[PDB]
């Protein structure tokens, strides 16, 4: 992406980001979801098994 | 889980605990302490 380099499984998200947010986190301060820099689809990030 | 934290299952599931409890009640009710 634009940073937030990492490894995981990218799936469609049901999250509703406010138009300015771009990124998102969990309770654990980990990345929860990322807005795709192009087309702006929100994707959830799941750790690999 | 993102940092390696794994939760393990119990050997005895709630269903098995319920069966042991039921057996103890059946014993208590129909045969006392014998």
């Amino acid at each position: 992406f634009n940073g937030l380099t990492g490894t995981g499984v990218l799936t469609e998200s049901n999250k509703k980001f406010l138009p300015f947010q771009q990124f998102g986190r969990d309770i654990a301060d980990t990345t929860d979801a990322v807005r795709d820099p192009q087309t702006l689809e929100i994707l959830d990030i799941t750790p690999c098994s | 889980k993102f940092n390696g934290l794994t939760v393990l299952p119990p050997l005895l599931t709630d269903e098995m605990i319920a069966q042991y409890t039921s057996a103890l009640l059946a014993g208590t009710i129909t045969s006392g302490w014998t």
Partner: protein, 49 residues
Amino acid sequence: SLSSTPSALGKLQDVVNQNAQALNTLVKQLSSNFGAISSVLNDILSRLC
């Protein structure tokens, strides 16, 4: 009594809550810098020589 008084089962609820906190603490301590320039290992690896 068990239905109307939620505190009745407090002993079992407490065991659950203490272990949940021990894990949440472990998770949050992970994001502290501990004297490092960044708590994110990937930031250190990505920019520092």
